[PDB]
């Protein structure tokens, strides 16, 4: 089963245990081998692995990390994935002195939006977009990568699992403790990351739900019933919230041009019904001159 693969080195820990680099000894393919540990106790196979494997068998797209194979052995389950060289977190730390060129940021946003629109149109939200899970290769591609916190949604949605994106990239409708979130939570993440590539630092880097939420208020302003109908009767709204004024987006992301600002504001609309969908965003003027340059 594993006779075929030679482990090269560990790479990281994701949402359910360890990921390694490996070589297919026979084809020469380099792969990422994610090891799950099973036990006639562990409640057998993890809920997170069940959703990742099943959802990701359905998602073949050039901007979603491809699942090549799933190896059941006796007490181990191995997921064989395509290998990418680096992630966007590491790349932004390595690109700090000279910044990421605007064509590349635009290439990468476009491709991620493509991957997201795809997911969403197959009833899947990712629920964990962050730079650690966006992988890049030397050719100028970028792909979505940890579908272990994903879930299949219905139309309309149900109440799903609550504390759900990593804090920094968590949308306000989760922080305010709404019933229903949908696709709009991933777009919010992607808008945050889009800001982060431009400025090289995280847009709303809180260390608690309330801190995260005040940080957002200080930059988009405190939402009231005009910009967000419903807002003041959501479960974790407090009338004792401070009222900050919305800042002009030229100050939120100074490198950004007339259009990138527009896009970014539509990605961070407070109301999830008006917040731009990945599908609509691909058509946005910002991308009229998009191409596909290479990094590194």
């Amino acid at each position: 089963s594993m006779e075929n693969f030679q482990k090269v080195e560990k790479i990281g820990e994701g949402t359910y245990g360890v990921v390694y680099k490996a070589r297919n000894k026979l084809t020469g393919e380099v792969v990422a081998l994610k090891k799950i540990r099973l036990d006639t106790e562990t409640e057998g196979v993890p809920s997170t692995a069940i959703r990742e494997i099943s959802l990701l068998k359905e998602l073949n797209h050039p901007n979603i990390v491809k699942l090549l194979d799933v190896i059941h052995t006796e007490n181990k389950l191995y997921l064989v994935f395509e290998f990418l060289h680096q992630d966007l977190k590491k790349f932004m730390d390595a690109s700090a002195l000279t910044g990421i060129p605007l064509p590349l940021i635009k290439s990468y946003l476009f491709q991620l939006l493509q991957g997201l629109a795809f997911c969403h149109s197959h009833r899947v939200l990712h629920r964990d977009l962050k730079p650690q899970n966006l992988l890049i290769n030397t050719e100028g591609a970028i792909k979505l990568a940890d579908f272990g916190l994903a879930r299949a949604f219905g139309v309309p949605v149900r109440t799903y699992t609550h504390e759900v994106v990593t804090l920094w990239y968590r949308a306000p409708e989760i922080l305010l403790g709404c019933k229903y979130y949908s696709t709009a939570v991933d777009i919010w993440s992607l808008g945050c990351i889009f800001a982060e590539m431009v400025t090289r630092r995280a847009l709303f880097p809180g260390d608690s739900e309330i801190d995260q939420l005040f940080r957002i208020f200080r930059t988009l302003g405190t939402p009231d019933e005009v910009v967000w109908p419903g807002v003041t009767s959501m479960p974790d709204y407090k009338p004792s919230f401070p009222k900050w004024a919305r800042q002009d987006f030229s100050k939120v992301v100074p490198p950004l041009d007339e259009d990138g600002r527009s896009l970014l504001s539509q990605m961070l609309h407070y109301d999830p019904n008006k917040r731009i969908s990945a599908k609509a965003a691909l058509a946005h003027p910002f991308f009229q001159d998009v191409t596909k340059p290479v990094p590194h």
């Binding site: 149109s121 696709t183 969908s277």
Partner: protein, 255 residues
Amino acid sequence: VPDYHEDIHTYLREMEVKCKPKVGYMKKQPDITNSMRAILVDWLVEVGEEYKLQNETLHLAVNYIDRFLSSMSVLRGKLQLVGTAAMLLASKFEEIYPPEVAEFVYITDDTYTKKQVLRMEHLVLKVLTFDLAAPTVNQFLTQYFLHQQPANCKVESLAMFLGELSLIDADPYLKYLPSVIAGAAFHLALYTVTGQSWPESLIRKTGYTLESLKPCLMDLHQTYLKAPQHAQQSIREKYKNSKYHGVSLLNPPET
């Protein structure tokens, strides 16, 4: 999310055609029958109650069992083990708080070990080739409910009731796709309460006219009329309750 209503409808229509169990399967099983399967599906409903599992979980559990049994012979002694492991998986896939493995062992009266339930889960996944994201009658109903003016809590719950009853009787319902069993359930519910028909918006959205629905609609009409005497009764009891507005009680129509 009207941006992806249509893409998803379209995609779940592609998908229901691929998770289709073989209609004949029951005939090819040496040991089990349509009325062993009914006992089993009625029992899962009762498990769904005892752990307040979602309707979806039940519907996926049944889709997994029918595919499983489509390619794998099972003795009567293990039919329930197959059902348990399927219901575990469905819960893991669908529920926020899935029940611990121990809880499923407890509701089989320890006729199976935990060691068995886990081995069966591994096998049910191997045979289903990990393809657990199956369309259900419920995912169609839910979509359908938005083409309803005004919305009507009674209609929806009754629609769900008939969709759920369809899981019990493998003959005749194995031959209908879920989008159709949904169509019928919805229209039969809409007629039984408001006296309206399958709306034109749903003809534009599914391409099922009221006449393409007819075959299935004839069967569902009869399951519903004969539902009081049917040997398995947990679904009827379920839908007496305030949650579902007591629509199991509602007396079915003339034709």
